Amino acid sequence: DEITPDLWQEACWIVISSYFDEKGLVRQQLDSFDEFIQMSVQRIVEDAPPIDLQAPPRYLLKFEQIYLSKPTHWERDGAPSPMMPNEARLRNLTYSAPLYVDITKTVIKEGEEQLQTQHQKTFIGKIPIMLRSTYCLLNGLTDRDLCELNECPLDPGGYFIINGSEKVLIAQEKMATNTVYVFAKKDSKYAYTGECRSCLENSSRPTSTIWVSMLARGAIGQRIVATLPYIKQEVPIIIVFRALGFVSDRDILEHIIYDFEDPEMMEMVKPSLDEAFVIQEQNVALNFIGSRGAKPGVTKEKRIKYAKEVLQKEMLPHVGVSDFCETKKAYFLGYMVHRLLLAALGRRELDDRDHYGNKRLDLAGPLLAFLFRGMFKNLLKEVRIYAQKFIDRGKDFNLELAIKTRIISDGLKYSLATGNWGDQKKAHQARAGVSQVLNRLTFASTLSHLRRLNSPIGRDGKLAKPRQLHNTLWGMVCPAETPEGHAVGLVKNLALMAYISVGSQPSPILEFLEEWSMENLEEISPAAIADATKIFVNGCWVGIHKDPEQLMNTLRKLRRQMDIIVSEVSMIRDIREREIRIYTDAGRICRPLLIVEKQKLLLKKRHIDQLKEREYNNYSWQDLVASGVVEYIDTLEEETVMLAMTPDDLQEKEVAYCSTYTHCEIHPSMILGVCASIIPFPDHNQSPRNTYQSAMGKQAMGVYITNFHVRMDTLAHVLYYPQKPLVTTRSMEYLRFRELPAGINSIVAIASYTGYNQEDSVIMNRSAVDRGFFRSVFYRSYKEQESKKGFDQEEVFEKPTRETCQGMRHAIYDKLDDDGLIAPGVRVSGDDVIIGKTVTLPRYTKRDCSTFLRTSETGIVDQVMVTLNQEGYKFCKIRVRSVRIPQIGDKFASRHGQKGTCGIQYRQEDMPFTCEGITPDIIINPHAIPSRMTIGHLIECLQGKVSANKGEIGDATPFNDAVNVQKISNLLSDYGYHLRGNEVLYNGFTGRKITSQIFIGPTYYQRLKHMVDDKIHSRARGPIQILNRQPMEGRSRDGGLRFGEMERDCQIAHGAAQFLRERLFEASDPYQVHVCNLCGIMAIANTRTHTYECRGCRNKTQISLVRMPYACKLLFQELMSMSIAPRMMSV
Amino acid sequence: MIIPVRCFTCGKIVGNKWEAYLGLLQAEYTEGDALDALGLKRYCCRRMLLAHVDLIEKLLNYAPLEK
Amino acid sequence: PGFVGIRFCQECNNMLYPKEDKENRILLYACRNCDYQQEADNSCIYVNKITHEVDELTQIIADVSQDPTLPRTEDHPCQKCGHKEAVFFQSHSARAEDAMRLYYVCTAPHCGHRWTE
RNA sequence: AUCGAGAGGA
Ligand SMILES: [Zn+2]
Ligand SMILES: [Zn+2]
Ligand SMILES: [Zn+2]
Ligand SMILES: [Zn+2]
């Protein structure tokens, strides 16, 4: 029955495999989008108010149902056809499906003359579709079906195709809503502040933040204030309580202080009462609120109405926005004050801003919902204006012409295309970085980009606290994978078994709590709240309970049985403070864990047995979760959980550590993400090395996707001979690194050989490189289109001619065909022409606008595709193919942060060799190891020697006590090798033995995208910028290198004044001006007629020539634009 | 994508051994014994056969450009 | 000394503020909303414990013994019920510097005795 | 071509 330790390493990984058979790696994206389409769009459409318009006749126009068909495309003839994602990629279409809404317009004029007209399936917009979602044409297709459609079966999906560009929505971090968080700002007028970003269940407005603060000590005592929304002045809490109908001080403290035996709380609230005694009735308090507001009505009536509306709608919407909710709002605001007092009295800890239990991940669904709310509101507005301008004339109108569908369509398309998350007009208030271009450089880069999280703290911020690896990231975020540049700690990555909750309605839970012995908050007396336990659901205090323990037992039983409580519902019992917080909302990152009985796992051997035959008896992960054996625990419920790292922790020990565990890790290696799960032996490296590899696995070459032959990507690198690593971890089985690997096993020798590998460099074998070692192919796609925008000027693909075309370069166009397009198989060098495009003029009647190769490439045309774009003019894509043979300067890396460029390449006779004539493919310098402490590199090399000599794949899973260095060495000594991986090598040049026995063996190396040929650049009098006549910027522009301020300072320190003048004047922008010797302002010179005159001074004899930079002339002219007179006085 | 022709290290021909290697593996050989049957004694050539991923078999799941 | 609690009027249920009656030279507690008055019984109006000599045993609740994440010990039996097992934990409360002190709670149900060594 | 944004390198 029990899984014994000897079977555990199989059982756990069997369980893990079942998880990845059920979910995958992009499950969060697909589930978010599916919830958005199934629920969020319908909720948004129904939550909009019916637009009642009347001059008389009236019309309501109620939207009642939505229909999202499959993705289709409409040609110029208008025939709807099912559009495949690959066709969208090739034709630069948007993989979107039409959204139709049912509309009901009832005519009501008078005399009960009512009649309803329903417009079924009114086309309301087009919604882009996430690939492999339920509403994707690739849904449920087999691998054969996907290959029939020219799709990769290993492609995870989880992205959109907007204008042929694959866009991926990055999950955005945000502070959780409807939760009270008591912080303390050191530099502020308030000692403690308790904030609550409140938002109603079905979002319709932004988060309304309410603060309840305490004024810092230094009138008599510490005063509690409340910064309500839409009010620009602090308001005493007692005033707010009275404005809600609680005038008696006893009632207010009944709502705030639940234990009247506690004078400390009492004296700390007393200043607030003493400050609010002149105001003692609800109307006066409402008048005070309205007066403190930023729109103080001259008459107290409208002041009181405004205060009523604010306190009913903007104050704590999550508690309830309807009327008669003042009791719930009073109880909740009293809870906020109670929490603030507990913090000020030291009875509760301040809340941690960085705790991921306090955060939420805004995924594709809830982000598209924000867009859709804004866009549907704008659409209903436009419909209101259109219908109003017609009914004002007293006649009917056609809603089909009122609905301008471009709002929703173009809005979603623009937002996903650019990443600016918001309305196109508010292009600066909008937050960019959402919806990035999917990284297709290697399969690991694609997976990681699809599992990418973002902390929008702002890269400019230099506070390290949000960048720090918090304790609560354990199991939810990769500890290693993070960019090492300016976004350290802000851009994160999901751990492998991390699941972001999609969201759920609290209705069944609330109903069960009602049927259960919970007492509502309006029905109780406050005297009961002392000993009772509060119950919050999605931040709303809904009631109280008397035995929280057996309530938690009941709820956990219900969730483990897949009863009314779904698996993703978090249920935290804080014991010391008697809250029970239940969460069903979306964005809660959680992970699966094995539940533990008294001191035993519930995962018995029968579950492993049924999981082994997963493909026959359809016993899956969901059956494991439904059995009550596995549980999803979120960051906030982990605080109440006692984990076992392994079932070995559940053994009874000579001194028991815990003996009351509640859960167990499925495997600790699941704390790593996609790119860190490729590192072998990451627990033997320094952690920065693991981070650098997690970044560098994403630039590694491989086969980024199986269907690369049909993709017209702008840039693509494919390795000739990708190999799976000889030394692998058990997590790559689910990353599909074995099916799409990104490196080669290289016989690497760590040695000092000729000095060409010093300081992070490598010596490669020229003979190996000749045999296809780390050879790659680079595919570059050029796009072009001939626009017939108007009869004024039209472009067209056609072989240009020297007699008709004007802007025709001296490059030869013979490689083009009569259609103007080069043919595949044609070898093209730099500056060559691949598309001959000519544009009609207003060298006559047509000008050359041909597409050249990006300079200095020298490839062969791989293929040419011709089609029609969305509007329907001819559209061409040409993929050119360039074989990249590794060379000096190309960057290579192992899986341990050990990067370096090729210093030199030696032939096989020049490389050092073992007694059996094995030469290293790569030689790396021993000095790269000691400071870096990448012992995982050495253990991987030794394990790889054992694996190659044994005919197996080494197990480098991080935390594995069945694999240590002594075992690997003992294994290697059985194959006739030195147990530590050393060998006697001979000098290739002289054949003499090397005195020091070299450490050599197979290690998995990666070829990175950074090849020297894509970086080398030179300039000598090339093109210049228009504004300031200085060299351009970039290799692509043939630009010059920037001689910056620091270079100026260095050369000033050198004392090299002529070199400094050459760099900053003569090699950048030499220029001449003519200055009036009297006024010092630039004069008018006419060198052809030799007439120089200053219009200002009315002189034409006292002019002087001045040699100045063009940028300085431009500066002085831009100062004269500002009415400044910079007078260059030559005397 | 396809089995290399030569071993990158020594230059021994491994191109003619992939199919035989697979046939030995379905014959219930261990990978080590299979590599021994094909005469790959240096761990470089054993690396070549043992770490190869036949991606061409997946690229042949797509219909060609011309019928 | 001990703290002093707030007391409310019997008519308006607002807090009673302190006042002095010169006629009898006696402390009274009177409401500044209604016209109620009361004869005080403590004679103390304000108390500040600067030292903050708070007995944290009063802040503990027996329910904490149900926490699986707290450590348990068999070495400190309960003086009230004789149960062997007991959870222990530190103060973890602000304004307490010498907070390495351990507080124990009996894990027996319905006993919930709390103490300190 | 410009501008902006994003992703990256040292
Ligand atoms: Zn002048
Ligand atoms: Zn070889
Ligand atoms: Zn009174
Ligand atoms: Zn006891």
Residues of chain B contacting residue A920, judged by C-beta atoms under 8 Å apart: 9
Q: Is the CB of A1015 under 7 A from strand D?
A: no
Collect contacts of A968-973 with beta carbons under 8 A, ≥24 apart.
A968/A939, A968/A942, A968/A943, A969/A942, A971/A946, A972/A942, A972/A945, A972/A946
Cβ partners under 8 Å of residue A974, min gap 6: none
Give Cα A216 to chain centroid, integer Å: 39
Asked if A493 and A453 touch (Cβ cutoff 8 Å), the reply is yes
* Beta-sheet pairing, A985-986 with A913-914: antiparallel
Write out residues 672-711 of A within 8 Å (CB-CB) of B. 703, 706-707, 709-710
Asked if A786 and A799 touch (Cβ cutoff 8 Å), the reply is no
Q: Given an 8 Å threshold on Cβ–Cβ distance, is A919 in contact with B1? A: no
CB atoms within 10 A of CB C99: 12
Count Cβ neighbours within 10 Å for each residue of A742-766 and write b for 16 or more, e otherwise. bbbbbbbbbbbbbebbeebbbbbbb
Using alpha carbons, select from A162, A136, A160 the residue that is nearest to residue A82.
Answer: A136
Determine if residue C44 is labeled as part of a ligand binding site: no
**Backbone dihedral region of A1005: left (phi > 0), alpha (psi from -120 to 50 degrees) or beta?**
beta
Asked if A323 and A334 touch (Cβ cutoff 8 Å), the reply is no
Q: Given an 8 Å threshold on Cβ–Cβ distance, is A250 in contact with C92? A: no
Cβ partners under 8 Å of residue A560, min gap 6: A595, A628, A631
Chain D footprint bases within 7 A of protein beta carbons? 1-10
Write out residues 337-356 of A within 8 Å (CB-CB) of C. 346-347, 349
CATH of the domain at A290: 3.90.1110.10
* Beta-sheet pairing, A452-454 with A171-175: parallel
Query: Residue A831: exposed, middle, or buried by beta-carbon count in 10 A (0-12, 13-18, 19+)?
Result: middle
Q: Given an 8 Å threshold on Cβ–Cβ distance, is B1 in contact with A738? A: no
Angstrom distance (rounded) from CA A1119 to CA C15: 69
Chain A CA closest to residue C32: A277
Q: What are phi and psi of A482, to 5 degrees?
A: -165, 145
Alpha-carbon dihedral A265, A269, A271, A276, rounded to 10 degrees: -160
What are the structure tokens assigned to A694, written together?
A: 């997690």
Q: Given an 8 Å threshold on Cβ–Cβ distance, is B55 in contact with A703? A: yes
Residue located via tokens 């012992």? A935
Q: What is the largest CA-CA distance in chain C?
A: 64
Tell me the angle at which helices B43-50 and A935-950 cross, rounded to the nearest 10 degrees: 90
Asked if A155 and A740 touch (Cβ cutoff 8 Å), the reply is no
Helix (H) or strand (E) holding A868: strand A859-868
Using alpha carbons, select from A168, A7, A157, A154 the residue that is nearest to residue A733.
Answer: A154
Partners of A105 in beta bridges: A117
Q: Is the CB of A342 under 7 A from strand D?
A: no
Please report the DSSP string for B1-29 in residue order.
----SB-TTT--B-TTSHHHHHHHHHTT-
Using alpha carbons, select from B35, B37, B48, B60 the residue that is nearest to residue B4.
Answer: B48
> What's the sign of the alpha-carbon dihedral A31, A34, A38, A41?
positive
At A370, which amino acid appears? Answer: F
| Alpha carbon distances (Å) from A917 to A264, A1005, B47 | 84, 22, 15
Task: Write the DSSP symbol of residue A78.
Answer: -
**H helices of A1041-1092, where?**
1045-1054, 1057-1061
Query: Residue A82: exposed, middle, or buried by beta-carbon count in 10 A (0-12, 13-18, 19+)?
Result: exposed
Identify the three-state secondary structure at position C84.
coil
Instruction: Detail the DSSP E strand segments found in A786-829.
Output: 795-797, 827-828
Task: Write the DSSP symbol of residue A289.
Answer: H
Identify the three-state secondary structure at position A19.
helix
Query: Residue A409: exposed, middle, or buried by beta-carbon count in 10 A (0-12, 13-18, 19+)?
Result: buried
Q: What is the largest CA-CA distance in chain A?
A: 113
- Residue A271 exposure: Cα atoms within 13 Å on the Cβ side: 14
* Beta-sheet pairing, A53-54 with A58-59: antiparallel
What angle (nearest 5°) sits at the alpha carbon of residue A205, between those of residues A180 and A179? 10
Alpha-carbon dihedral A618, A621, A626, A628, rounded to 10 degrees: 130
At A273, which amino acid appears? Answer: L
Identify the three-state secondary structure at position A234.
coil
CA of A1126 to the centre of ligand 1 (A): 13
Cβ partners under 8 Å of residue A730, min gap 6: A13, A16, A669, A955, A957
Give Cα A657 to chain centroid, integer Å: 40
B48 alpha carbon, closest ligand: 2
Angstrom distance (rounded) from CA A694 to CA A701: 14
Please report the DSSP string for A413-424 in residue order.
HHHHHH--BS-S
* Beta-sheet pairing, A436-437 with A359-362: unpaired
Q: How far is C100 from chain A (nearest CA, A)?
A: 16
Angstrom distance (rounded) from CA B35 to CA B17: 9
A165-168 sheet: strands from edge to edge: A160-162, A165-168, A436-437
Asked if A421 and A432 touch (Cβ cutoff 8 Å), the reply is yes
Question: Straight-line distance from CA A1032 to C1' D2, in Å?
Answer: 13
Using alpha carbons, select from A20, A360, A25 the residue that is nearest to residue A171.
Answer: A360
Task: Write the DSSP symbol of residue A994.
Answer: P
Angstrom distance (rounded) from CA A1 to CA A606: 7
Please report the DSSP string for C17-60 in residue order.
EEEEETTTTEEEEE-SSS--EEE-SS-------SS----TTTT-
Angstrom distance (rounded) from CA A511 to CA A45: 26
What are the structure tokens assigned to A469, written together?
A: 């690896």
Partners of A783 in beta bridges: A877
Domain ranges of chain C: 1-48, 49-117
Q: Taking the C1' atom of D2, which residue's CA lies nearest?
A: A1026
Angstrom distance (rounded) from CA A800 to CA A657: 83
Q: How far is A710 from chain B (nearest CA, A)?
A: 9
Task: Write the DSSP symbol of residue B60.
Answer: T
Question: Straight-line distance from CA A162 to C1' D4, in Å?
Answer: 19
Q: Given an 8 Å threshold on Cβ–Cβ distance, is B8 in contact with A772? A: yes
CA of C11 to the centre of ligand 3 (A): 5
Q: Is A662 on the interface with C (CB under 8 A)?
A: yes
Which of C15, C68, C94 minimises the CB distance to A642?
C68
Asked if B53 and A723 touch (Cβ cutoff 8 Å), the reply is yes
Q: Given an 8 Å threshold on Cβ–Cβ distance, is A267 in contact with C3? A: yes
CB atoms within 10 A of CB A1032: 16
Q: Given an 8 Å threshold on Cβ–Cβ distance, is B51 in contact with A745? A: yes
Alpha-carbon dihedral C46, C51, C53, C56, rounded to 10 degrees: 100
Angstrom distance (rounded) from CA A748 to CA A896: 14
Q: Given an 8 Å threshold on Cβ–Cβ distance, is C4 in contact with A263? A: yes
Question: Straight-line distance from CA A439 to C1' D10, in Å?
Answer: 22
Using alpha carbons, select from A971, A967, A958, A681 the residue that is nearest to residue A9.
Answer: A958
At A198, which amino acid appears? Answer: S
CA of A335 to the centre of ligand 3 (A): 26
At A1110, which amino acid appears? Answer: Y
Asked if C32 and A290 touch (Cβ cutoff 8 Å), the reply is no
Q: Is C37 on the interface with A (CB under 8 A)?
A: no
CA of A1112 to the centre of ligand 1 (A): 19
What are the structure tokens assigned to C20, written together?
A: 């002095």
What end-to-end distance do the CA atoms of chain A give, in Å? 102
At A1105, which amino acid appears? Answer: L
Identify the three-state secondary structure at position A965.
helix
Partners of A883 in beta bridges: A777
Nucleotide closest in space to A445 (CA vs C1') = D7
Catalytic residue among A102, A760, A817, A955: A760
Angstrom distance (rounded) from CA A89 to CA A176: 37
What angle (nearest 5°) sits at the alpha carbon of residue A819, between those of residues A818 and A825? 85
Q: What are phi and psi of B61, to 5 degrees?
A: -80, -10
Count Cβ neighbours within 10 Å for each residue of A664-674 and write b for 16 or more, e otherwise. bbbbbbbbbbb
Count the residues in chain B: 67
CB atoms within 10 A of CB C3: 14
Chains C, B in contact, 3 or more Cβ pairs below 8 Å? no
Q: Mutate which of C69, C84, C105 to test chain A, going by most A C-beta atoms within 10 A? A: C69
Chain C CA closest to residue A280: C33
Angstrom distance (rounded) from CA C48 to CA C60: 22
CA of A1027 to the centre of ligand 1 (A): 26
What are the structure tokens assigned to A4, written together?
A: 């014994």
Asked if A570 and A634 touch (Cβ cutoff 8 Å), the reply is yes
Chain A CA closest to residue B9: A768
Partners of A833 in beta bridges: A852
Count the residues in chain C: 117
- Note if A818 is an active site residue: no
Angstrom distance (rounded) from CA A1052 to CA A685: 44
Q: Taking the C1' atom of D10, which residue's CA lies nearest?
A: A485
Asked if A280 and C31 touch (Cβ cutoff 8 Å), the reply is no
Residue located via tokens 């028991």? A656
**Backbone dihedral region of A758: left (phi > 0), alpha (psi from -120 to 50 degrees) or beta?**
beta
Q: Is the CB of A947 under 7 A from strand D?
A: no
Q: How far is C25 from chain A (nearest CA, A)?
A: 25
Q: What are phi and psi of A839, to 5 degrees?
A: -115, 130
Count Cβ neighbours within 10 Å for each residue of A993-1023 and write b for 16 or more, e otherwise. eeeeebbbbbbbbbbbbbbeeeeeeeeeeee
Asked if A617 and A670 touch (Cβ cutoff 8 Å), the reply is no
Angstrom distance (rounded) from CA A561 to CA A541: 26
Nucleotide closest in space to A1036 (CA vs C1') = D1
Angstrom distance (rounded) from CA A548 to CA A574: 10
Angstrom distance (rounded) from CA A70 to CA C78: 69
Task: Write the DSSP symbol of residue A357.
Answer: G
3-state secondary structure A922-964: EEECHHHCCCCCEHHHHHHHHHHHHHHHHCCCEECCCCCCCCC
Q: Given an 8 Å threshold on Cβ–Cβ distance, is C94 in contact with A659? A: no
What are the structure tokens assigned to A285, written together?
A: 């308090």
| Alpha carbon distances (Å) from A969 to A945, A1055, B45 | 10, 60, 21
Angstrom distance (rounded) from CA A350 to CA A339: 10
Q: How far is C35 from chain A (nearest CA, A)?
A: 15
- Residue A31 exposure: Cα atoms within 13 Å on the Cβ side: 18
Subunits with 3+ Cβ pairs within 8 Å of C are: A
The radius of gyration computed from the CA coordinates of chain B, to the nearest angstrom, equals: 14
CB atoms within 10 A of CB B9: 28
Angstrom distance (rounded) from CA A48 to CA A62: 9
Asked if A470 and A355 touch (Cβ cutoff 8 Å), the reply is yes
CA of C12 to the centre of ligand 3 (A): 5
Cβ partners under 8 Å of residue A77, min gap 6: none
Angstrom distance (rounded) from CA A1078 to CA A1128: 10
Residue located via tokens 């090699």? A1067
CA of A958 to the centre of ligand 2 (A): 30
Residue located via tokens 């600067």? C50
Determine if residue A1094 is labeled as part of a ligand binding site: yes
Query: Backbone breaks in chain C (C–N > 2.5 Å) follow which residues?
Result: none
C112 alpha carbon, closest ligand: 4
Angstrom distance (rounded) from CA A193 to CA A224: 9
Angstrom distance (rounded) from CA A171 to CA A1060: 49
Q: Mutate which of A533, A576, A577, A637 to test chain C, going by most C C-beta atoms within 10 A? A: A576
Q: What are phi and psi of A938, to 5 degrees?
A: -70, -40
Angstrom distance (rounded) from CA A335 to CA A517: 22
Asked if A927 and A770 touch (Cβ cutoff 8 Å), the reply is no
Angstrom distance (rounded) from CA A356 to CA A664: 20
Angstrom distance (rounded) from CA A209 to CA A327: 20
What end-to-end distance do the CA atoms of chain B give, in Å? 23
What are the structure tokens assigned to A300, written together?
A: 């107290």
A1125 alpha carbon, closest ligand: 1
Question: Straight-line distance from CA A485 to C1' D9, in Å?
Answer: 10
Query: Residue A533: exposed, middle, or buried by beta-carbon count in 10 A (0-12, 13-18, 19+)?
Result: buried
Count Cβ neighbours within 10 Å for each residue of A945-958 and write b for 16 or more, e otherwise. bbbbbbbebbbbbb
Q: Is A565 on the interface with C (CB under 8 A)?
A: no
At B28, which amino acid appears? Answer: E
Alpha-carbon dihedral A100, A86, A437, B58, rounded to 10 degrees: 140
Nucleotide closest in space to A695 (CA vs C1') = D8
* Beta-sheet pairing, A954-955 with A727-728: parallel
Determine if residue A147 is labeled as part of a ligand binding site: no
Instruction: Detail the DSSP E strand segments found in A507-627.
Output: 519-520, 533-537, 540-545, 570-573, 580-583, 589-595
- Residue A818 exposure: Cα atoms within 13 Å on the Cβ side: 0
